[PDB]
Amino acid sequence: AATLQLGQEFQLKQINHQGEEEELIALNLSEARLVIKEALVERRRAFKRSQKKTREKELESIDVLLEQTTGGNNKDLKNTMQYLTNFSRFRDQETVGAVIQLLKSTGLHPFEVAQLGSLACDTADEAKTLIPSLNNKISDDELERILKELSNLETLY
């Protein structure tokens, strides 16, 4: 369910391919778009390297230029890019670093701060109702403050 008890591969304890221990990486729908859109750029550079020898139009055009890169078998990722972009209010990785600085300052679980940064709320009761894991783990005034700073970090693009 939603009681901080996920599956086996989705447990808090993860193991990388080198053999070291790593915490579960939880992403909100802000940097999750800049990471896909990010890696697709270096993927385009990798596709054009071996070849030698307003906010919606750019999104769909770049998704077409990257669709030409792939073999036309992963369009659900581009429709997912339209989903995130249509539901994203963040931009630039610097502000995202500030958001992580505000989420890690309370000392919560990565999934919890992911649900915090991925949802648009105005009061603390909204965050406590949409997130059943957060109801007494953190103060309400601090959540309202985080929503205030976030409200100052969002800008209509």
Residues that bind another protein (CB under 8 A): 1-2, 6, 9-10, 14, 16-17, 24-27, 29, 32, 35-36, 39-40, 42-43, 46, 70-71, 73-77, 79-80, 83-84, 86-87, 111, 114-115, 119, 126, 129-132
The distance of closest approach from Cβ of residue 32 to another protein in the complex, given in angstroms and rounded to an integer, is 4
| Residue 43: partners with Cβ closer than 8 Å, 6 or more residues away | 66, 69
The distance of closest approach from Cβ of residue 98 to another protein in the complex, given in angstroms and rounded to an integer, is 20
The distance of closest approach from Cβ of residue 113 to another protein in the complex, given in angstroms and rounded to an integer, is 12
List, as one string, the DSSP characters of 127-150.
HHHH-TT-SSSS-HHHHHHHHHHH
Query: Smaller CB distance to another protein: residue 96 or 131?
Result: 131
Q: How far is CA 134 from the centre of its chain?
A: 19
Query: Smaller CB distance to another protein: residue 32 or 146?
Result: 32
List, as one string, the DSSP characters of 63-83.
HHHHHTTTTS---HHHHHHHH
The token pair that represents 79 in the structure block:
């429709």
